[PDB]
Design a protein around this ligand. Structure first.
Ligand SMILES: *[C@@H]1O[C@H](CO)[C@@H](O[C@@H]2O[C@H](CO)[C@@H](O[C@@H]3O[C@H](CO)[C@@H](O)[C@H](O)[C@@H]3O)[C@H](O)[C@H]2NC(C)=O)[C@H](O)[C@H]1NC(C)=O
Ligand SMILES: *[C@@H]1O[C@H](CO)[C@@H](O[C@@H]2O[C@H](CO)[C@@H](O[C@@H]3O[C@H](CO)[C@@H](O)[C@H](O)[C@@H]3O)[C@H](O)[C@H]2NC(C)=O)[C@H](O)[C@H]1NC(C)=O
Ligand SMILES: *[C@@H]1O[C@H](CO)[C@@H](O[C@@H]2O[C@H](CO)[C@@H](O[C@@H]3O[C@H](CO)[C@@H](O)[C@H](O)[C@@H]3O)[C@H](O)[C@H]2NC(C)=O)[C@H](O)[C@H]1NC(C)=O
Ligand SMILES: CC(=O)N[C@H]1[C@H]([C@H](O)[C@H](O)CO)O[C@@](O)(C(=O)O)C[C@@H]1O
Ligand SMILES: CC(=O)N[C@H]1[C@H]([C@H](O)[C@H](O)CO)O[C@@](O)(C(=O)O)C[C@@H]1O
Ligand SMILES: CC(=O)N[C@H]1[C@H]([C@H](O)[C@H](O)CO)O[C@@](O)(C(=O)O)C[C@@H]1O
Ligand SMILES: *[C@@H]1O[C@H](CO)[C@@H](O)[C@H](O)[C@H]1NC(C)=O
Ligand SMILES: *[C@@H]1O[C@H](CO)[C@@H](O)[C@H](O)[C@H]1NC(C)=O
Ligand SMILES: *[C@@H]1O[C@H](CO)[C@@H](O)[C@H](O)[C@H]1NC(C)=O
Ligand SMILES: *[C@@H]1O[C@H](CO)[C@@H](O)[C@H](O)[C@H]1NC(C)=O
Ligand SMILES: *[C@@H]1O[C@H](CO)[C@@H](O)[C@H](O)[C@H]1NC(C)=O
Ligand SMILES: *[C@@H]1O[C@H](CO)[C@@H](O)[C@H](O)[C@H]1NC(C)=O
Ligand SMILES: *[C@@H]1O[C@H](CO)[C@@H](O)[C@H](O)[C@H]1NC(C)=O
Ligand SMILES: *[C@@H]1O[C@H](CO)[C@@H](O)[C@H](O)[C@H]1NC(C)=O
Ligand SMILES: *[C@@H]1O[C@H](CO)[C@@H](O)[C@H](O)[C@H]1NC(C)=O
Ligand SMILES: *[C@@H]1O[C@H](CO)[C@@H](O)[C@H](O)[C@H]1NC(C)=O
Ligand SMILES: *[C@@H]1O[C@H](CO)[C@@H](O)[C@H](O)[C@H]1NC(C)=O
Ligand SMILES: *[C@@H]1O[C@H](CO)[C@@H](O)[C@H](O)[C@H]1NC(C)=O
Lengths: 175, 328, 328, 175, 328, 175
């Protein structure tokens, strides 16, 4: 995908994540756990349904048209009837083929986009208190209990509340 | 707020996305199979095999083609004054009355098929000096010899066939379709025996147009014991125009007119069974659902139908890329 | 660069983008209405209601159809030798000379409409043994009886109509269109009275092709006091070919040829007024501007015009998403 | 949009910003102020005009074609004339419908792209002296007078000039 | 691991991408020329100038059109029973036998061109009471006068042209094409001299159809010393149907049938040389390679060919943007 | 491009980089060096070839069709034969013109994407030991010999190994 999150810096997916499309596994003070992010799952789903409905938009109805099957050989007019329908079919076949290709390409990049958007949103929130491990995991540099994790996920984490703790614990250089 | 602790602890948060053990392969701009979490099929490729009789008025022709129904072949008299949205012609339909050909049969099958009605109105034509109502053994109306229920075979009365010259004004506010014809005798004897004159002539005209046909004598293949043919012709007469039939031989006169409608009507050749169900889209293979945007069942369709395409499968990804762990 | 200060101060920088209080809704791949800051309409959907007379040469047919103009109906004599880019035919045009029909009228209206010229050149045909210049009361040239200014009704002389057999070589370097015809008498007496023989015949040929028509006697509806019809036919004669007109009755002879051009010419049926203005795109509804890529005014167009489409509005976003301050 | 700046991390737009499309709003000890960014405004505008011109590119002219209106009923040939034009219209209607949809989708993501590009460009420039507040605002950690703001906006801000001031003021951990 | 050092040093890493000194300009959604590192042409716009004779069976008509080959013009007798995938007709082909015209020539050229075979089978028609095998000086078969090798000019025997009435059943399992014709005498004397009766008639029928033609007497232009014409007609006879030829004058009888095939065959007019090489795509300008998706050589093609397009160049970027440092 | 790396924050290309599409130039204790990145060069190339093959996918073959050249003037039927072919050509010409435009646009943004993806991947790896100079160059704040550069490029650089060195050298505020 264009953003390189899915099948990119996020190594692989979680077959275990059965409650949403994007989410958070964490390991902390109480222990290890997982939760779906419902806001980006809805954002990806609504865009995919938006696409779908527009493709599934109005059928055109047609009634009396031309004959498309012939049982005798007639020459010039029948030759044309066959050429009109044949080239109509080839043009619509091209169109259906290009449509699902552009469509599919875009679905793969928009879901990649949402992954990266969630990530960046968490990055921004944690401010100076976490570091990016690269693999799609942040290392939170301060005591973060299960309600702390809950506030990051529900978008209320105040970084100031743990800034001095984190910042000390982060830059205490020694090996 | 709190106090400088002598302990230091971190946490780990990891973001990720689901994956399913079973993805679907889908095509893109840059790949021909890439596996996504989920996809939808966009090509309808199967029929019920049955023409649903709803919402369109299907009329099953059974063993009548529409032209035989129009002309009034004895065995097709069931269809008199019928009305359809889709007339379905069956492969086993047969004709079984006097042998005829229709020059530009294909346009006639089209004009009435789109008109959607077979409503016939008899007009009082007075044929002076000829024997009306002739029929033939090739067209049995029950035990007896008969003819098409809408044509009138005119023969010489006594020993002469005058020059027929008749008019029928279109005084109504609608177009009138008149079906008429000409008999081609098999022998020069048959010509005189029937119409007296050595060469008949039929001229059918309106203020807008004229058509004159001369019969053509000659042996054609035996069909229902006949080697003569009649040929069918048609004249639409506009409101306020007049029809003038004029002949001194071989005329197969009209008994009145068919009304013409304009509407969503058509004809379809199909051997699929009509059945009772709702379906907007008719295909010769039976009805198909039009919930998908494209179909691959048949390029002949009537009604709200998917666009026929050559592809038989075209899957729209409705999910992200599948990058599983492995599992089961 | 400087030394540690005692006062600590920060600043705040915020990036952002405009918004307008009034966005336009526009369609996308994933949404059917999303509000953007600004958009352009891509479907032209209104006409001036007037056919601009510039840059194309419009010729208003007024009450002449192009075929009447071609044939030379008295009331259409204004158009002799005229020339057009677009010939406009008006709904109220009428014919008012001898009743005629043109088998394949529609191709004749097309060949001359695309030729763009009505330039006629008289050729010296010598009709030996017949009465030239016949006319009729159905085609008054002023007080007197007349005929089409480009056809020549040939009648018998005294007691004889010979077999006409004439030639006119195409010695010029261009194709020549000859318009000719045949008269169908209403009665068998009219036939002999006019052309002596019981059945005329007209054969018009070139080294490339031949066409022979036999007239068809019979009463047709009274039109301008006539129940006879003439039918019009055409023969293009290639450079270096020859025309050979041959008849022993019912010939309505040609007085020469029309030149054929190849070019951007066409005909349009429209009742819109011609007016003085520049406009590249003509539509039966009047000219329309071709600044937009698509139009919804009329599928009939002539000249540099937008592509007709079914949509009557199609808005191209020319701005970012509108996310206004005073929210929902 | 794919980048999540417009209608994303940047909460909403400024109806007040009447002089450019993208811009800067600030608060320093000298006061507050606003200024349009003309370089990304031009970048977004030129791409939108590029799109426009290509759509508004050459009309094809046609002259003698086929009849498209008929006053009598003819059958087989007229049936074909109507089918040819009807399927021509449906194909061009599809084309215009897909064209403005792809086009519009791309305009929304390219303006989203430019927003994010401006942001990132400012981010990079400020180097270690500012922190991202998340909402599209940077907190500049040093005395930044109106000429300092002007140098950030006009792309001349030297981060070294205020690095030690900022860096101290930034990592002075205490609450 | 080691102890804190008293020295301190940095490194610089810079990422970047290549650039070439010579980019190619390519078109996009937002720009009309943007320079990329590399591109591919997608429009094939040149021909070899030669029709490769492989893999399709090309048959060079040389100076025979397909209809002359079909009819059996003396100079085209080389093509008897030939077979083709593509028949190529040359501009310099000429006819050189009795002057004929084919009403709907264009459908006849099409039905046999698609059939792909000229396989003729002679059938034993017995013409009782007429002089078979007539020929003419306009169609020399070597020193002598002759005719089309597949037609049979019947002339009256003794002093009588009887009414011919013959049948030939289609007992085989395939369709049979019969080519037949009618002679139009130049004079009324020629009519009687040749066929006795004043007006011939030809009626060719099957159980499915009939066609009757009457000849048309009259002088046409001298072509190969003849002012008479014959006109060609065709009748496909289905399996199990019967042909009944019936005439009392002017019949140019069939000598049997042509077999009809259904397949990939067609005809092409071209003056390009056939040459030995493999090429799937034939164009009148010679073969072209079908490795590209679109072509601009010619809209007439036969075989696996690129889609004709109006653009003569369309370059697909196969590389990133070219942003050179030195440039030029 | 949508990401703003190529012809964006990376000022210009390297005509000198003849061994790959994307790459690294470096400066260190051992001297200066340049090396192509083969993994993103392959990623950009495979996507471009993917596009190419799909365009160069199956030719449709056609055999007996309609006449497209006429030597006499016939009127109504020939008018139609010419209209059918003419509108067929215009529709396929539009299609080829839109196809290479969408295609080209995407090629420029996917190569821009890969540039930015390489960059971001290096960024993430170097963790707290380097700073972004903005111009597409990182300033590595510790002694980084040619094997150190080699490990960054081949994706094995351990940031902990030089964290305290870098972190000290980075935040020693003084001018
Ligand atoms: C012109 O030639 C054709 C072919 O010889 C003649 O047609 C044949 O005419 C006879 C009667 O004259 C037909 O006979 C009937 O056949 C049916 C078959 O089942 C049988 O049931 C009857 O009892 C009777 O035999 C025969 O079918 C017919 N053949 C064809 C091919 O149609 C025709 O009569 C000749 N015309 C003249 C005026 O000589
Ligand atoms: C064949 O039958 C038709 C219909 O009866 C005959 O046509 C009619 O002929 C008369 C004259 O013979 C026409 O009279 C004219 O009527 C108009 C009415 O507006 C008037 O303008 C004239 O002053 C005159 O009175 C009549 O219109 C015409 N009717 C039609 C429908 O055309 C025809 O004469 C018969 N032919 C023969 C040879 O018997
Ligand atoms: C009807 O009129 C046409 C034109 O006058 C007559 O056609 C001409 O007929 C003569 C012979 O009767 C042809 O003569 C030949 O000319 C060729 C020229 O190369 C020459 O090679 C022959 O030896 C012979 O002299 C002349 O070509 C021909 N003209 C045309 C235009 O075809 C026709 O004979 C008249 N018919 C009757 C029955 O009067
Ligand atoms: C109106 C009329 O003449 N009808 C008669 C026909 C015709 O003479 C032939 O069909 C001419 O083809 O011949 C019959 O022998 C028949 O069909 O059985 C009797 C029939 O009553
Ligand atoms: C050349 C010629 O014969 N013209 C005469 C015609 C024809 O006899 C009829 O039109 C045959 O239909 O008849 C008239 O009575 C008429 O039109 O008023 C007089 C006219 O001079
Ligand atoms: C079967 C037959 O009659 N053939 C004769 C023809 C025809 O009479 C004319 O072609 C009628 O047009 O005339 C010839 O003079 C000729 O062609 O040289 C001699 C030829 O043997
Ligand atoms: C977020 O987490 C905090 C801490 O657990 C909790 O008190 C709060 O209710 C949550 N906020 C929301 C908006 O769900
Ligand atoms: C796959 O997509 C279709 C259309 O969005 C949806 O109806 C279906 O439930 C999806 N499957 C799953 C497992 O989500
Ligand atoms: C057909 O409809 C007309 C018009 O009402 C009627 O007079 C006629 O008798 C009907 N005939 C039949 C067979 O239904
Ligand atoms: C539909 O029927 C046609 C012929 O009637 C056949 O060729 C085609 O394969 C059928 N398709 C399906 C889906 O039944
Ligand atoms: C909207 O877009 C069109 C085309 O770019 C432009 O002419 C018009 O001025 C724009 N409107 C505003 C308010 O910018
Ligand atoms: C039409 O043009 C020709 C050619 O110059 C001329 O001889 C003829 O007299 C013109 N006729 C009229 C009515 O203008
Ligand atoms: C144009 O005129 C046609 C009929 O002439 C009409 O149906 C159509 O609505 C008109 N459209 C406009 C924009 O005037
Ligand atoms: C940027 O801002 C500085 C400080 O106010 C000013 O001196 C300089 O002229 C500005 N630079 C540019 C390129 O406008
Ligand atoms: C340009 O692209 C084509 C198709 O990918 C390729 O064959 C050609 O070698 C490329 N040119 C260079 C210099 O890479
Ligand atoms: C054409 O083929 C048929 C069928 O085998 C054969 O009898 C006939 O003699 C052949 N004629 C020629 C000239 O090859
Ligand atoms: C192909 O030939 C046609 C006419 O036969 C000509 O107009 C066209 O320009 C030629 N194109 C090429 C590429 O040779
Ligand atoms: C990466 O660089 C290190 C240090 O030079 C070297 O030892 C190692 O072999 C390289 N690793 C790979 C995977 O190439």
């Amino acid at each position: 995908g264009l953003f390189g999150a899915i099948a990119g810096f996020i190594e692989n997916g979680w077959e275990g994540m059965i409650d949403g499309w994007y989410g958070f596994r964490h390991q902390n003070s109480e222990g290890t756990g997982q939760a779906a992010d419902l806001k980006s799952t809805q954002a990806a789903i609504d865009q995919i349904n938006g696409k779908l409905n527009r493709v599934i938009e109005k059928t055109n109805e047609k009634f009396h048209q031309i004959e498309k099957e012939f049982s005798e050989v007639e020459g010039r007019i029948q030759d044309l009837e066959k050429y009109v329908e044949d080239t109509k079919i080839d043009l619509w076949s091209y169109n259906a083929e290009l449509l699902v290709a552009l469509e599919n390409q875009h679905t793969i990049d928009l879901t990649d986009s949402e992954m990266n958007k969630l990530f960046e949103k968490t990055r921004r929130q944690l401010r100076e208190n976490a570091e990016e491990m690269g693999n799609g995991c942040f290392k939170i540099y301060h005591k973060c209990d299960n309600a702390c994790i809950e506030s990051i996920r529900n978008g209320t984490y105040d970084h100031d509340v743990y800034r001095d703790e984190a910042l000390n614990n982060r830059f205490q250089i020694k090996g | 707020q709190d106090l400088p602790g002598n302990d230091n602890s971190t946490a780990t948060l990891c973001l990720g996305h689901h994956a399913v053990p079973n993805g679907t392969l889908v095509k893109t701009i840059t790949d021909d199979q890439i596996e996504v979490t989920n996809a939808t099929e966009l090509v309808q490729s199967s029929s019920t095999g049955k023409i649903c009789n709803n919402p369109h008025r299907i009329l099953d022709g059974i063993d009548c083609t529409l032209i035989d129904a129009l002309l009034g072949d004895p065995h097709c008299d069931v269809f008199q004054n019928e009305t359809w949205d889709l007339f379905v012609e069956r492969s086993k339909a047969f004709s079984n009355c006097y042998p005829y050909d229709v020059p530009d049969y294909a346009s006639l099958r089209s004009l009435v098929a789109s008109s959607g009605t077979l409503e016939f109105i008899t007009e009082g034509f007075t044929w002076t000096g000829v024997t009306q109502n002739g029929g033939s053994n090739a067209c049995k109306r029950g035990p007896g010899s008969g003819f098409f229920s809408r044509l009138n075979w005119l023969t010489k009365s006594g020993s002469t066939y005058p020059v027929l010259n008749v008019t029928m004004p279109n005084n109504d506010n609608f177009d009138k379709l008149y079906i008429w014809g000409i008999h081609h005798p098999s022998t020069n004897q048959e010509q005189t025996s029937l119409y007296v004159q050595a060469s008949g002539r039929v001229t059918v005209s309106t203020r807008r147009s004229q058509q004159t046909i001369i019969p053509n004598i000659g042996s054609r293949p035996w069909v229902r014991g006949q080697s003569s043919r009649i040929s069918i012709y048609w004249t639409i007469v506009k409101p306020g125009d007049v029809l003038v039939i004029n002949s001194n031989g071989n005329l197969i006169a009209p008994r009145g007119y068919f009304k013409m409608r304009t509407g969503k009507s058509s004809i379809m050749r199909s051997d699929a069974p009509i059945d009772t169900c709702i379906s907007e889209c008719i295909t010769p293979n039976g009805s198909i659902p039009n919930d998908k945007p494209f179909q691959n069942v048949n390029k002949i369709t009537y009604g709200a139908c998917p666009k026929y395409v050559k592809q038989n499968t075209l899957k729209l990804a409705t999910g992200m890329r599948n990058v599983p762990e492995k599992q089961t």
